[PDB]
């Protein structure tokens, strides 16, 4: 997964695309999707 307040998705992101089992994939901005 990715950590809390980490990146699950982005325009130019290159890491885990799954949020933590305590966090969820959500959008903060069209260039940064956060794990909440």
Ligand X SMILES: *O[C@H]1O[C@H](CO)[C@@H](O)[C@H](O)[C@@H]1O
d(CA 10, CA 32): 4
Rg from Cα positions in the chain: 8
The least CB distance from residue 23 to ligand X, in Å, is 7
Phi-psi region of 25 (alpha: psi -120 to 50; beta: other; left: phi over 0): beta
The least CB distance from residue 26 to ligand X, in Å, is 14
Site for ligand X in 1-36 (CB under 6 A): 1-3, 5-7, 12-15, 18, 20
Residue numbers of the site for ligand X (CB under 6 A)?
1-3, 5-7, 12-15, 18, 20
């Amino acid at each position: 997964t990715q950590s809390h307040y980490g990146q699950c998705g982005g325009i130019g992101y290159s890491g885990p695309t799954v949020c933590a089992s305590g966090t969820t994939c959500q959008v903060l901005n069209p260039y940064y999707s956060q794990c909440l």
